[PDB]
From a paper:
Glutamate dehydrogenases (GDHs) are ubiquitous oligomeric enzymes that catalyze the reversible oxidative deamination of l-glutamate to 2-oxoglutarate, at the crossroad between the Krebs cycle and ammonium assimilation. Large glutamate dehydrogenases composed of 180 kDa subunits (L-GDHs180) contain long N- and C-terminal segments flanking the catalytic core. Here we show that the mycobacterial L-GDH180 (mL-GDH180) adopts a quaternary structure that is radically different from that of related low molecular weight enzymes. Intersubunit contacts in mL-GDH180 involve a C-terminal domain that we propose as a new fold and a flexible N-terminal segment comprising ACT-like and PAS-type domains that could act as metabolic sensors for allosteric regulation.
Cryo-EM and SAXS data uncovered the intrinsic flexibility of native mL-GDH180. In contrast, 2D averages for side views of mL-GDH180 tetramers revealed a high degree of flexibility at distal ends, where ACT*1-2 and PAS domains reside, and their corresponding densities vanished in 3D cryo-EM maps. A 3D-classification of the detected mL-GDH180 particles was performed to distinguish alternate conformers of the enzyme. Two mL-GDH180 conformers were found, called the open and closed conformations, for which the ACT*3 module, the HM3, the catalytic domain and the C-terminal region were defined in each monomer, achieving an estimated 3.59 Å resolution for this region in the open conformation. The two conformers differ in the relative positions of the centers of mass of the subunits. The catalytic domains in mL-GDH180 monomers in contact through their N-terminal segments are found closer to each other in the less stable closed conformation compared to the open form. A comparison of the mL-GDH180 conformers identified by cryo-EM shows that conformational changes in the N-terminal region correlate with alterations in the relative positions of the catalytic domains. The catalytic domains in the mL-GDH180 complex were not found to contribute intersubunit contacts. Instead, the N- and C-terminal regions of mL-GDH180 provide dimer-like interactions between pairs of monomers.
Residue numbers in the entry:
A (entry chain B): 629 to 1588
B (entry chain C): 1434 to 1588
């Protein structure tokens, strides 16, 4: 009967996979072929019986040949397909718990677990996860999908026992995007009970049976998960395989369970089960529950969404910390998101805020009194809007109940809500709909469900009946800024329509990621301290004290990460219109190679892209966030396959992930972290995308023609040489002082132009692969020495345009030193060629830079470079051509620098060197200079004129 | 030559006419032989063999198809033409810098391609993809011109 259970579980998995024939057809086929079923049973048993490993070589060829020689003899198409599916399932099986016999395991409790490789199963619909775990039992049935070795995700207590794997596979994509900024990879699991709770007709007894039966099934599902999962033992530091378990894949020990719609209160139960199994993660197996961080006291999710709200308001020119603004909210002063988000600013004027029970209306709210009352309400352990003080409410406003038939409308409420002038009373449904469509500065979301829909989206496809009566249209919402503190507040198409309606909006996974990030960081810390617990460095009863001590620093680190991502999104929004073609090329590349689905990820189609191109508009902000997340995931996958995290020059920033206390006290444990490579990869990709931009690596791939690994090397070299991170931080700090977002965005765009050109220079002028440490140590010191003295050698038009740009920057509040440093970025790029030239001519870089920039002013190369920058980039080939002519000009000036410094004496300045070089030229050089002069006089700046000018500069050099 | 002779043109005159664009390259061949103080026979052999190796004839024909409606486009098209010719001159210097005179053009090209680098490999792949694309505007020909240029160290 046990082997029958194995076959039954495989058949149930096939039904979950969407196999056409039903269970009755499957069992009929198996019954009509008992010899074949015997062959498959022998195959599975011999593969996974540990005793077979003690019986010499396993009967691999014999079992495989017997099965094949029986399958090919079949004549029935349905029988052949069914038995082939089972044969492939047996071949794809990696681990099982059929032979473990320890009493505490789930096997003794009649639970069967299978670890499967979905990549080699024919009947599985796309996408195919990296690892799958199928747990079958007569009481509970669950699945778990993972896309990588280090994975994280929640567990649904689903009720769709007929086909729940489709629901899990649908949610795994959104979960994968949700984990773009955090270390692990998106994963998703889900279990369902098979016998429903006892139907007795009494609500008190029914709801008790649902919870009671759910815990026992939840315990069993996790127990099956831990049977096949490996364990990490710090007695030796290696990964141990559970006994009586025969593996066919490699090693896999990471497994983290997150709360979800049916697991929010099951965290402590999961941790207790992990303790029973003796799992290495311990209390980190589940997020929070009873040991961890008070997310209510932290409010990290509300702060994370408030960063996006503040960025949008700064883009509007409004400071939420010093200017009063009106807010419509969803929720009450009792939840984590809404409660912490409504107390972050004393200038908040909550005009209206509905909930699941009652509605709060304030036509002309105050600031200090409103903040005080909101704080007082948040002080209670539990409260609603009915507890709001009716003495502090404005005239005409108040608190009403959602269960009333109708609510009278005051003229003040109507004036503060922007409704039809003839209304005098309204119903709670229409009141909520009118609140959702209001001329209000901020729309704070802290509730559950979807309240905003797209115009073309169907009500049933949303998947929320409770809000089906109150769902509104995205293009109809009148709010300027929408902050999504909760999950799934607005659909992706609704986000696209809202951003196309002029409103500012980002993806929810970009706003509320802080709560996930703080969940990841704590886990990433809980492991490290646990290591120090085994080493004796951490006293066991001081461990919890240490976590409670580092809570604020953890929140600060997560907030810094969210600030970085928000700043990158703002800059990308500023440069969204001019990079539409490159974005479309990136989408096509990801679709062709990484198997991205445009409709599933809400990315625009080719027709939509060309329609926007004819309309002169780039991608929407949520679309940009989605593409940025996918690029981050692809870069993570590329780096993990490489050895960059292994090398020290990239691993030098590992301690910065952890708080300062751990940074000082724990050094060897940090250097010997279990998830070190993944943390390094996440940090590198986050820094690269945040600083260089979304399209940095892809443009490198098209232009240079190398893999993303070399792009990462180039960005690291440039960041260490020029200090791009410090400049970006200074720009952000200046923007925080009162500088408008336009000036800061332009500064970041110029800096990104600098890093693009410089990285291309390293990829084109240095041996491949790039020795990052070598080029850093041979360029960075000289660049840092020559950068401050830039004013010593700029002449003529170069000095004039730099002074103009620096003055324009400083006129908006930018510091003069930062403004001048920004205006010289294109000239700081030339210092790389200056250092290379000085290395070749074994001379000091001061004279080399002097003569180089003097010669640049002599030929007026700045005007030609600016004209080259104006060249069209509508297709790829024109882009390659314009970078070609740019690099040709730069190389020509390099050769001219060789020619000029080949004569003269070092004490001579740039002007004298140019004079004596022009003295000994020929009619060829005279004709070339006259041609450039006539070209400048003509004023034509098409490709042909710039090209002939490029050879004129080339012809000035003998080596050409 | 066959098309010319099909109308009554003598075969010798027809072949001499059809080789005019290649008789032009003999000036560069003689200059190269003068620089490398070698016989012009081997120089011409390797030069035209390298021309067939890179398919410079197709690029020159495409350059000849460029528009001449104004003066500047004419200067640009003569610029790209002379750039291609000078690049093949430099490649001839590089190829004849190694090997032995008894080796023919094919062997010299083979041993030159043997000791190249990833830069030259990328350039040749780029020209191959350019030929596969079939686009013959100014931009594509210009980037192809640097690909041929990038095959040379002195560039």
């Amino acid at each position: 009967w046990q082997q029958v259970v194995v076959l039954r579980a495989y058949a149930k998995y096939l039904r979950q996979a969407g196999f056409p024939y039903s269970q009755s057809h499957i069992e009929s086929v198996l019954n009509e072929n008992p010899h074949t079923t015997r062959s498959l049973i022998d195959l599975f048993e011999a593969l996974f019986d540990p005793s077979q490993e003690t019986d010499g070589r396993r009967d691999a060829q014999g079992a495989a040949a017997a099965v094949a020689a029986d399958i090919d003899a079949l004549v029935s198409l349905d029988t052949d397909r069914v038995l082939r599916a089972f044969a492939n399932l047996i071949e794809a099986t990696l681990r099982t718990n059929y032979f473990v016999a320890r009493p505490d395991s789930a096997r003794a409790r009649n639970v069967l677990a299978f670890k499967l490789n979905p990549l080699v199963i024919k009947e599985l619909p796309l996408p195919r996860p990296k690892f799958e775990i199928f747990v079958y039992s007569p009481r509970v049935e669950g699945v778990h999908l993972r896309f990588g070795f280090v994975a994280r995700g929640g567990l649904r207590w689903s009720d769709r026992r007929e086909d729940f794997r489709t629901e899990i596979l649908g949610l795994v994509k959104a979960q994968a995007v949700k984990n773009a900024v955090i270390v692990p990879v998106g994963a998703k699991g889900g279990f369902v009970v098979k016998r429903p709770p006892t139907l007795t007709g009494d609500a008190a007894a029914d709801r008790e049976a649902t919870r009671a039966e759910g815990v026992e099934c939840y315990r069993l599902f996790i127990s099956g998960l831990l049977d096949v999962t490996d364990n990490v033992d710090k007695a030796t530091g290696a990964v141990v395989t559970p006994p009586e378990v025969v593996r066919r894949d490699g090693e896999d020990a990471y497994l983290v369970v997150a709360a979800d719609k049916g697991t929010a209160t099951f965290s402590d139960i999961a941790n207790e089960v992990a303790k029973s199994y003796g799992f290495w993660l311990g209390d980190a197996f589940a997020s929070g529950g009873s040991i961890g961080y008070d997310h209510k006291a932290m409010g990290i999710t509300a702060k994370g969404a408030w960063e996006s709200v503040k960025r949008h308001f700064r883009e509007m020119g409004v400071d939420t910390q010093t200017q009063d603004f009106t807010v419509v909210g969803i929720g009450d002063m009792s939840g984590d998101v809404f409660g912490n988000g409504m107390l972050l600013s004393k200038h908040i004027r909550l005009v209206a805020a509905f909930d699941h029970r009652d509605i709060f209306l304030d036509p002309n709210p105050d600031a200090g009194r409103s903040w005080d009352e909101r704080k007082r309400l948040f002080d209670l352990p539990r409260s609603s809007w009915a507890d709001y003080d009716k003495s502090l409410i404005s005239e005409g406003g108040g608190v009403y109940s959602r269960q009333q038939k109708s609510i009278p409308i005051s003229p003040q409420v109507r004036t503060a809500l922007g409704l039809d002038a003839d209304v005098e009373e309204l119903t709670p449904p229409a009141l909520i709909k009118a609140i959702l469509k209001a001329p209000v500065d901020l729309l704070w979301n802290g509730g559950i469900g979807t309240y905003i829909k797209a115009e073309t989206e169907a009500d049933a496809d949303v998947g929320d009946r409770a809000n089906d009566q109150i769902r509104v249209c995205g293009n109809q919402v009148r709010a300027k800024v929408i902050g999504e503190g909760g999950n799934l507040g607005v659909t992706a198409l609704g986000r696209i329509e809202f951003d196309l309606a002029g409103g500012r909006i980002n993806t929810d996974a970009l706003d509320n990621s802080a709560g996930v990030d703080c969940s990841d960081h704590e886990v990433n810390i809980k492991i490290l301290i646990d290591s120090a617990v085994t080493a004796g460095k951490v006293t066991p009863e001081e461990r919890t004290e240490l976590l409670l001590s580092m809570t604020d620093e953890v929140g600060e680190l997560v907030l810094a990460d969210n600030r970085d991502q928000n700043d990158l999104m703002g800059t990308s929004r500023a440069n969204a219109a001019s990079l539409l073609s490159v974005h479309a090329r990136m989408i096509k590349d990801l679709v062709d190679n990484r198997g991205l689905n445009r409709e599933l990820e809400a990315l625009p189609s080719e027709k939509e892209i060309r329609r926007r191109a004819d309309a002169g508009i780039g991608l929407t902000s949520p679309e940009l966030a989605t593409l940025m997340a996918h690029v981050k995931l692809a870069l993570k996958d590329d780096v993990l396959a490489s050895d960059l995290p292994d090398q020290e020059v990239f691993a030098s920033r590992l301690p910065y992930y952890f708080p300062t206390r751990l940074r000082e006290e724990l050094h060897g444990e940090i250097r010997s972290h279990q998830l070190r490579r993944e943390i390094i990869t996440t940090m590198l990709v986050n820094d690269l995308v945040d600083t260089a931009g979304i399209s940095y690596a892809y443009r490198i791939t098209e232009d240079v023609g190398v893999g993303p690994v070399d792009a990462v090397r180039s960005y690291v070299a440039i960041n260490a040489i020029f200090g791009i991170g410090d400049v970006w931080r200074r720009i952000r700090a200046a923007g925080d002082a009162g500088v408008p977002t336009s000036v800061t965005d332009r500064m970041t765009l110029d800096l990104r132009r600098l890093v693009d050109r410089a990285g291309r220079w390293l990829l084109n002028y240095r041996p491949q692969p790039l020795a990052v440490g070598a080029e850093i140590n041979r360029f960075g010191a000289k660049v840092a020495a020559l950068t401050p003295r830039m004013s010593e050698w700029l002449r003529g038009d170069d000095k004039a345009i730099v002074s103009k740009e620096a003055g324009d920057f400083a006129s908006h509040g930018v510091p003069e030193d930062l403004a001048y440093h920004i205006a010289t970025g294109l000239y700081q790029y030339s210092l790389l060629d200056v250092i290379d030239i000085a290395d070749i001519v074994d001379r000091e870089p001061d004279e080399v830079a002097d003569t180089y920039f003097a010669l640049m002013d002599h030929l007026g190369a700045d005007a030609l470079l600016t004209a080259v920058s104006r060249l069209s980039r509508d297709d790829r080939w024109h882009s390659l051509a314009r970078l070609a002519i740019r690099d040709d000009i730069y190389g020509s000036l390099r050769a001219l620098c060789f020619d000029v410094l080949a004569v003269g004496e070092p004490d001579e300045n740039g002007e004298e060197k140019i004079a004596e070089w022009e003295t000994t030229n020929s009619s060829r050089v005279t004709r070339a200079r006259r041609t450039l002069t006539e070209i400048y006089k003509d004023g034509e700046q098409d490709l042909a004129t710039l090209s002939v000018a490029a050879r004129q500069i080339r012809s000035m050099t003998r080596t050409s």
